[PDB]
Automatic annotation (TrEMBL), chains A, B:
InterPro entries: AcetylCoA_hyd_C (IPR026888), AcetylCoA_hyd_C_sf (IPR038460), ActCoA_hydro (IPR046433), ActCoA_hydro_N (IPR003702), NagB/RpiA_transferase-like (IPR037171). This is 4-hydroxybutyrate coenzyme A transferase. The lineage of its organism: Bacteria, Pseudomonadati, Pseudomonadota, Gammaproteobacteria, Enterobacterales. It holds the Pfam family AcetylCoA_hydro. Residues 283-425 form the Acetyl-CoA hydrolase/transferase C-terminal domain. CoA 1 binds at residues 61, 88, 91, 200, 249, 335. It comes from Yersinia pestis. Residues 6-195 form the Acetyl-CoA hydrolase/transferase N-terminal domain. CoA 2 binds at residues 200, 227, 229, 324, 339, 363, 369. One of its GO terms (biological process) is acetate metabolic process. Belongs to the acetyl-CoA hydrolase/transferase family.
């Protein structure tokens, strides 16, 4: 059982690692920070040379890594983006694609994040999976590090699995997170710091918002927080608490700070007791290092983590997410132009709470985020919404009539807009 | 327990039975054929005399029974309809309101049918619940008959429970379907035929669709079906199967036929093996009679039946529902202007299939039921849709790009609209 022998046998450069990937096939890669820069650069340039064509890349959550390599607009005709969710990177691509004689450059695949493993593995098929990893330990194992999501399944379903060993990637314990060297097909090495999530400051409203939310957080709450400044800031108010759990889609700096403070203990959880569960992690270097070899952290695949039935097995689940607009019905919209699983789970949880939070206004006070009607397709439907919060307060929509709902939602609007909004509600016959 | 003594201490006239209900309280009632006519008439009369007001009535699926009693437009100022799902009866009341100088006359309470039991019991709170029951037996039990749904919960959680004994009401076994006299607050008697859903005549497209759907029904399939002549026609084609199961939201005549023919055995089920499960039943006198003291039929509450996690636990779940519209995305819309729980449950089922079907055209071929995009809110989000079927075939949408979706859905449209649809696809850049 010589591991060092296999490693040196699979060790290679990006160029030959990616060389055998056929044209017309399906590739996928880790989410965000698990996107393998050297493997990707090697693939981009292979495409640039017109060496490979007709490659669909299926993925969730793209960053500049894939953005600046294999998803460059120029490569579009050879490496086709099948985005299962639109990021700023695809908004860039779509925009540039219209101002080019209205060509279609992004193929959107409509998908539930929690079904991604089944979709990619069984419905779509993935022939090549590529993922950054932590370095092979003494037992012959790499860790998927910050990723678990769908990767832990695709890494094994893909006919070929290629990993870019990066010492900067934390060794992270998780279900199927550890991968034996016999499970890997090729290895390139590339120790480079990991990409980061930008810290962005507390709007003054976040202060009042984060304080309404904390009183909505029960004893022994089991948290899921969205990535964002508001949620991060909310954890800042929870430094006060004890015995919180974590069962979250994304592990973020704010949550990790609660672990580091001994606030998060996971001793009240029914599932994964004693461990914080997330399906992937995003943050800054500080978070990344603190994750390495952490014994009270456990990544799980998304079809476990984001399964409402699983989420609801923990008592007092608290799910806190941001949206851009809330309407008077009051559905919610978080699209500029996944969390729903927790919206459902949190309410199903015994003593659970789903909280969708937002500033009532933007554009220095000129634009109301509380609107009459989302046009058109909402991200959280009106029948799913539980609690909503603005700096003007919180309301539980469940069981409210269209009338009760519009009235309480107006009260949460900026008073500057309460007038128009009451008028809009009257023409709509919401009231 | 001398149940004779009890039956008489509680037996009474509808007028007296309903006399003590307080104003500004919350009332609820059984669904469809379990709506109690004598009790309701006594109640409508109370409002006609100005003897009661500000009565909120929360309900689901409305029959002509409440339509013609407590929900008459005249009484809308004293008996306030808090309908949790809008039907023909509410659609009419709404029309009159807008014609009658824009009066809002129906209060819509947006809600998950599978969450109804807790919504009513906890978030809204019901003070009086009224339900037609089968006659008391020798052990002192009534049966909720065709009902279980939210009713089995609410007859317990409501602060007063009033029954209308009707000998025409089948004695039906199910979870919490039996109610002991000790748990009933007042009893009125009214032996009248059960109201019946209108048998709708077939249409020529239903033939082809039933054959396409039937090809999709695996062996030992665990059926759920919506009402309508399409699904009814489907159970016709399924005449020759063996060992099928039933776990359905509504029990219709098509399904009961398969039980009668011996096709449904429930032997391949994992839950409720050997028993057809439903949450409420709708049909005609024949079905209702057949249900009485049936030992292989078992009602269960909606939070069990419509819980996708429960549904998913049976293998080869097949969910068959009709829709009015399908767009190129393809979200679906079955509204003019519950089943979603099965769409998800059926896909999660091992070997499961959610089927949404519609004739490709309406109004003698003039209008396409396949359209570029659904107007307002949808009833089946595009990310949930599995199989759709028209008279022109079936496609499984899971994992297809927007383009592949558009192109395949178009081929399910009637040939007259395909070119129009194809043009629209490019305008929306679905290509």
């Amino acid at each position: 059982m010589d591991i060092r022998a296999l490693y040196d046998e699979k060790l290679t450069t990006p160029e030959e690692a990616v060389s055998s990937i056929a044209s017309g096939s399906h590739l996928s890669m880790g989410m965000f920070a698990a996107e393998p820069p050297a493997l990707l650069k090697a693939l981009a340039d292979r495409a640039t040379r017109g060496d490979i064509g007709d490659l669909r890349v299926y993925y969730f959550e793209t960053a500049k890594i894939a953005g600046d390599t294999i998803l460059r607009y120029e490569l579009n005709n050879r490496i086709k983006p099948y985005s299962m969710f639109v990021t700023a990177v695809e908004r860039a691509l779509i925009r540039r694609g219209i101002e080019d004689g209205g060509r279609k450059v992004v193929n959107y695949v409509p998908s539930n994040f929690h079904q991604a493993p089944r979709l990619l593995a069984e419905e779509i098929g993935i022939d090549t999976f590529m993922h950054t990893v932590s370095p092979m330990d003494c037992h012959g194992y790499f860790s998927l590090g910050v990723g678990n999501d769908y990767s832990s399944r695709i890494a094994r379903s893909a006919r070929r699995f290629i990993v870019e060993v990066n010492r900067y990637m934390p060794r992270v314990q998780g279900e199927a997170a550890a991968i034996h060297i016999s499970e890997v097909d090729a290895i390139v090495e590339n120790h480079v710091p990991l990409i980061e999530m930008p810290v962005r400051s507390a709007i003054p409203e976040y202060t009042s918002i984060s304080h309404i939310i904390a009183d909505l957080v029960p004893d022994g709450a089991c948290l899921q927080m969205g990535v964002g400044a508001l949620p991060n800031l909310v954890c800042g108010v929870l430094k006060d608490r004890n015995d919180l759990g974590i069962h979250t889609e994304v592990l973020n700096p704010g949550l990790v700070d609660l672990i580091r403070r001994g606030v998060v203990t996971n001793q009240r959880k029914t599932l994964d007791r004693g461990r914080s569960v997330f399906t992937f992690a995003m943050g800054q270097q500080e978070m990344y290092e603190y994750l390495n070899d952490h014994p009270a952290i456990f990544s799980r695949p998304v079809d476990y983590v984001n399964d409402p039935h699983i989420i609801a097995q923990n008592d007092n689940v608290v799910s806190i997410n941001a949206t851009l607009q809330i309407d008077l019905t009051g559905a919610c919209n978080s699209e500029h132009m996944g969390q729903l699983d927790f919206v459902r789970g949190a309410y199903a949880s015994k003593g659970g709470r789903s909280i969708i939070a937002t500033p009532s206004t933007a554009a220095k006070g000129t634009v109301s985020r509380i609107i009459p009607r989302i046009d058109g397709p909402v991200t959280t439907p009106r029948i799913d919404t539980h609690y909503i919060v603005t700096e003007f307060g919180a309301v539980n929509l469940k069981g409210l009539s269209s009338t009760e709902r519009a009235l309480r939602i107006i009260e949460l609007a900026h008073p500057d807009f309460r007038d128009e909004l009451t008028q809009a509600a009257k023409k709509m016959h919401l009231i």
